[PDB]
Amino acid sequence: NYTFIIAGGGISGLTLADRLTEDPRVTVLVIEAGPLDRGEDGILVPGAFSPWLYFWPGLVSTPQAGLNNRTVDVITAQVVGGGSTINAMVYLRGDKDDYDSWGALGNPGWSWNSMLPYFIKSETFTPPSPELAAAGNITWDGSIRGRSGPVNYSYPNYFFPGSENWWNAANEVGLPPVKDPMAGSKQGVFWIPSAIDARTMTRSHARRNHYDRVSSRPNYHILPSHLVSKILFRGKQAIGVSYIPTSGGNTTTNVYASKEITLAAGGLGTPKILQLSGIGPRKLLNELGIPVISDLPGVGQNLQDQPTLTIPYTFTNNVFPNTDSLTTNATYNAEQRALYDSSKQGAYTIVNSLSTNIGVMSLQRAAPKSYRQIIAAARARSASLSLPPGTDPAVIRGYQAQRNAILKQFENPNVGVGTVHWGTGSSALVYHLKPLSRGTVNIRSTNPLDAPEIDYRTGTDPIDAQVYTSLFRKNREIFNAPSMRVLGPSEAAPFGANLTTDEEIYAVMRELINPSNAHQCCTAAMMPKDMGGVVSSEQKVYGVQGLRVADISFWPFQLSGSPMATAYAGAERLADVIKKEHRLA
Ligand SMILES: Cc1cc2c(cc1C)N(C[C@H](O)[C@H](O)[C@H](O)COP(=O)(O)OP(=O)(O)OC[C@H]1O[C@@H](n3cnc4c(N)ncnc43)[C@H](O)[C@@H]1O)c1[nH]c(=O)[nH]c(=O)c1N2
Ligand SMILES: *[C@@H]1O[C@H](CO)[C@@H](O[C@@H]2O[C@H](CO)[C@@H](O)[C@H](O)[C@H]2NC(C)=O)[C@H](O)[C@H]1NC(C)=O
Ligand SMILES: *[C@@H]1O[C@H](CO)[C@@H](O)[C@H](O)[C@H]1NC(C)=O
Ligand SMILES: *[C@@H]1O[C@H](CO)[C@@H](O)[C@H](O)[C@H]1NC(C)=O
Ligand SMILES: *[C@@H]1O[C@H](CO)[C@@H](O)[C@H](O)[C@H]1NC(C)=O
Ligand SMILES: *[C@@H]1O[C@H](CO)[C@@H](O)[C@H](O)[C@H]1NC(C)=O
Ligand SMILES: COC(=O)c1ccc(C[NH3+])cc1
Ligand SMILES: [Mg+2]
Ligand code: NA
């Protein structure tokens, strides 16, 4: 038996395992649903991006009430490195108030100031070449970017020429250059920091930078292709776990730990381990005849993602080359693959279908004329309307406090609620960063191979549609600006210039929004128990000893940004909290 068992070898588990195994007297077992990736081009080479090699299979949503009852495929990782292995490598910190908010929901410690040292420790930033910084308008604040930590990030070493048109158009419609989107604000446009190792121009995922890097260590055990099926207890103490093969062979095995269990199975996996282990809402557990160890009705409640919209265009006069050239021009593709293989230059340094720059905006940057009308509607409506009738009152009090903090962010000029992106090809992306809508993930049985019922409940809160429609309109501004007009863009079916009203435009969005960018979070939320929280400030699950949540299940709510950089830094942080309590080197 081992000092610690970690359930899941994604960003959080692997980061924690690495730091705990720094004390050679400490032994760790990481059990991970997925295999080791085979170093295949679709993982390591940006231009080869093929996320679908390591998607969890047979995961489908309920009909989505907010999105014309559409049923969508659920995307999450099943592989050592979890999401970092298969993600678009977008490496962005939240805004200051994201972390200050978490502290103000009743979590001592938590702030931008307490998270800043861990973001720095987490990483090594490699500067781009000076000719690319100057030509690309790449800027950073060296003072707040790590130089010693394991996660490599940098930028591609190429941009598509059209990314210049987009930058100037974004500038032209109120989205200015951001000095460093990693400094706690990101109001305008910047280069996407990418989680790439610039020595090789290859993905820097948790498996390389928090396992291969330290895999010489005897005390750092990994077991790929196995599920944690249950937590094992002596009374209220978690002592070990049962594990089964992922492929569904008739085999169960108990392993035990001397100190703690850490759950790290992500937003769609950690709640399931708790519910099967009898840590969940009493009503769900009773209905299934699971003995109740800890009545926590917040387990599987409060699911959030960051919805996506793909807006199709045609161009009379698009500049060559662009991202779509890699698909349609076999010659261009081969010349750039040859150029990557030889001298590690060119289009293959960029994640396939993305560009190098991006915009983020606050509510009042998106909608300078109407943001007060949106806030008013939000402040008018009671928090309880967002949740099913019958929702536990502690869960409702928690959402109400999230909702209040999010409404202040709506008022804040320096907090993002949306992302705009153009790949330089036939589509643009608009991300809803801060939805007020709340979903569920609940086990349907006691069979640990069974999919949990996943209900995103995207667009159930009608304030989300007003925010999203503002985001859509600002994107349209960029494409209609002078610097993008010379390319002759026009919205393709089922959008178009012929949709002018909030209702015409959102009717289409309703049909097209993806509930998910696989940023599933918050389904075991770090708030007080009397506000429907599952974990304390030190990430300990309520009413049980020696069990914490490390994965982004613990987040109260979605950042102004994508989760990956906080997943790393949060795990770096929990690592110090555990070493503190049990006295390790
Ligand atoms: C395709 C795609 C693309 C993106 C992203 C995700 C995906 C799927 N994301 C999201 C981001 O990668 C994700 O939110 C983080 O990896 C979350 O880290 P965790 O440690 O919470 O989960 P993560 O998913 O990393 O780890 C959970 C692990 O637990 C395992 N598991 C589940 N149940 C288990 C069980 N019972 N037993 C054992 N193991 C179990 C899974 O196999 C998985 O590997 C992203 N973010 C970002 O910042 N930039 C981006 O560009 C993207 N893009
Ligand atoms: C990726 O991250 C690591 C961590 O900073 C870098 O590895 C260090 O590199 C220097 C010079 O190569 C060595 O002398 C150190 O011993 C290495 N490890 C450390 C400080 O932990 C690596 O340089 C980074 N990749 C890039 C492109 O810079
Ligand atoms: C979605 O299905 C439900 C039946 O459960 C029904 O109330 C509703 O009308 C449907 N909505 C749409 C827009 O199809
Ligand atoms: C860089 O910004 C300058 C304005 O400072 C502008 O002239 C140029 O077109 C921009 N190019 C890109 C690639 O963003
Ligand atoms: C697995 O094996 C045990 C004993 O060999 C038995 O209780 C059980 O029915 C088997 N299960 C399946 C699904 O075959
Ligand atoms: C295709 O790409 C090659 C290589 O860069 C280029 O010479 C050619 O002009 C392109 N052809 C078309 C039709 O885009
Ligand atoms: C800016 O691009 C992204 O954040 C992103 C793009 C594509 C995918 C994969 N479906 C995921 C994330
Ligand atoms: Mg240099
Ligand atoms: Na270069």
Author numbering: 46 to 630
Please share text taken word for word from the publication where this structure appeared.
The FAD-dependent oxidoreductase from Chaetomium thermophilum (CtFDO) is a novel thermostable glycoprotein from the glucose–methanol–choline (GMC) oxidoreductase superfamily. However, CtFDO shows no activity toward the typical substrates of the family and high-throughput screening with around 1000 compounds did not yield any strongly reacting substrate. The structure of CtFDO reveals an unusually wide-open solvent-accessible active-site pocket with a unique His–Ser amino-acid pair putatively involved in enzyme catalysis. A series of six crystal structures of CtFDO complexes revealed five different subsites for the binding of aryl moieties inside the active-site pocket and conformational flexibility of the interacting amino acids when adapting to a particular ligand.
Despite marginal differences in the crystallization conditions used for the preparation of the complexes, polymorphism can be observed, as demonstrated by three different space groups: P212121 for CtFDO:PESB, CtFDO:4NC, CtFDO:4NP and CtFDO:ABTS, P21212 for CtFDO:MAMB and P21 for CtFDO:IPEA and CtFDO:free. The position of the active-site water WAS (HOHA836) is similar to that in CtFDO:free (shifted by 0.7 Å). MAMB is hydrogen-bonded to Tyr476 and, via WAS, to flavin. One additional water mediates the contact of MAMB with Asn562. MAMB is further stabilized by van der Waals (vdW) interactions with the flavin, Ala133, Leu399, Tyr476 and Asn562. The formic acid molecule interacts via hydrogen bonds to Thr464, Ser607 in both conformers and, via a water molecule, to Gln351.
